[PDB]
Each structure stands twice: as structure tokens, then as C-alpha cells.
Amino acid sequence: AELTPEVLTVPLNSEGKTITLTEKQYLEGKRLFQYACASCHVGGITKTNPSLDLRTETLALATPPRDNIEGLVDYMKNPTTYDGEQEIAEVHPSLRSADIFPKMRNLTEKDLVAIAGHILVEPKILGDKWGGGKVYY
């Protein structure tokens, strides 16, 4: 098996347009994800709130949908709760809160796409392990 464009291809938006990442982008996003996100989201879980994960099906049911590049890039700017009703930038890393979350400061806009892409590709590769937890280690 290998890192083919079918796997590197993920939804851009809710409309259904798609985007094909490059290998470089995927590894870029994987690296960036370890830098800014893995301390809480290692393997697609959320250690400070295990009830919410980064599985694609979970992101699909977030309000607004987050199973796509647009929704994830937005979330990294203005993160909300799962039903959309309150902005949680004060307690979640995001560009809007890079003052309090200094790691987010040097994240450019393409960095955000590579992070979002990593998140959407990894479940296609790792399967249930992505966001499944220790049961699947």
C-alpha cells in the first residue's frame, strides 16, 4: 500500500468540491499537528475532553460541519463548541487566541490547510485507530 492521491484527496467544503493534497502537504500537516495539537489530540482523541474526537464521522456532525478543509481551517481560527453556540477561543488554541496560545502565532494559512488535511487523511489510513483510543493501540 502507499500514499496515493485517492487517499490524499479530501473534501474542501460542504458543497462537495474536493482537493488532492501532496505527500509534502500531508507530512507538512503531520509535523504541524505534532507541534501544535498532539499534546491533546495524539492519535485523534482529545485527552482533556475524551467525549469529542477527531474521527471524520464526529466532525461531520459538528455544527457547522468540520469534515472538510474549510470547516477545519475556520475552526483553527474561531473554534466553537460542537453545536456551534459558543466561541471557545479563550480555552482552545486558535489564531484568534494566538496571544494566549503562542504556538499558533507562526502558523500561516497554508500551514492551516496542511494541518486540516492531515486530520482528514489520517482516518483513511489508520482506520478505527484514529480517535479510537488505547483499545486500538
Partner 1 sequence: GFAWWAGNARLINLSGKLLGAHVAHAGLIVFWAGAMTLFELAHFIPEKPMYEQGLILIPHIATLGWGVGPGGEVVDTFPFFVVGVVHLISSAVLGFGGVYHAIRGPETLEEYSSFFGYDWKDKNKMTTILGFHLIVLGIGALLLVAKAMFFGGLYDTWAPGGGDVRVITNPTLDPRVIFGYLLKSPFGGEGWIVSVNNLEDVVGGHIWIGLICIAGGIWHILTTPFGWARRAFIWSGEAYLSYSLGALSMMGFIATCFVWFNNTVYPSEFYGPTGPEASQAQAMTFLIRDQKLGANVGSAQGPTGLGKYLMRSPTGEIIFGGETMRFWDFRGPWLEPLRGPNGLDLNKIKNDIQPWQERRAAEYMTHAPLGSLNSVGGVATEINSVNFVSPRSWLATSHFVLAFFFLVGHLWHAGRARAAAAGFEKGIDRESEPVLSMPSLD
Partner 2 sequence: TTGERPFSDIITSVRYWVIHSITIPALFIAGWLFVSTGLAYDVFGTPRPDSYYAQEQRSIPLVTDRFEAKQQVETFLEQLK
Partner 3 sequence: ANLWERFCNWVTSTDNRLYVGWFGVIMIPTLLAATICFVIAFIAAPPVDIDGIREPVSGSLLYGNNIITGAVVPSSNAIGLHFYPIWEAASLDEWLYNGGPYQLIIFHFLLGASCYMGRQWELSYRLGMRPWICVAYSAPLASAFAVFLIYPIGQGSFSDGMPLGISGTFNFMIVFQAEHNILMHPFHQLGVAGVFGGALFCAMHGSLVTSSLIRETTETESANYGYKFGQEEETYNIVAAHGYFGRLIFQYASFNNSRSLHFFLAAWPVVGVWFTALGISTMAFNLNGFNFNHSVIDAKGNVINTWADIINRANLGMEVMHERNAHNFPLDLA
Residues in the annotated binding site for heme c: 41, 92
Cα distance between residue 45 and residue 38, in whole Å: 9
Q: How many CA atoms lie within 13 A of 37 on its CB side?
A: 26
Q: Rule CB under 8 A: is residue 7 a binding residue for partner 3?
A: yes
CB of 5 to partner 2, least distance (A): 12
Q: How far is the CB of 26 from partner 1 (least distance, A)?
A: 15
Whichever of 63 and 106 has its CB closer to partner 1, that residue is 106
Q: Return the H-helix or E-strand segment holding 35.
A: helix 23-36
Exposure string of 82-97, with b = 16+ CB inside 10 Å and e = fewer, is: eeeeeeebeebbbbbb
How far apart CA 111 and CA 129 sit, in angstroms, is 24
Question: Residues 100-129: x/- map of binding to partner 1 (CB under 8 A)?
Answer: x-xx-xx-----------------------
Size of the site for partner 2 (CB under 8 A): 4
Binding residues for partner 3, rule: CB under 8 A, are 1-4, 7, 47, 50, 122, 125-126, 129, 134, 137
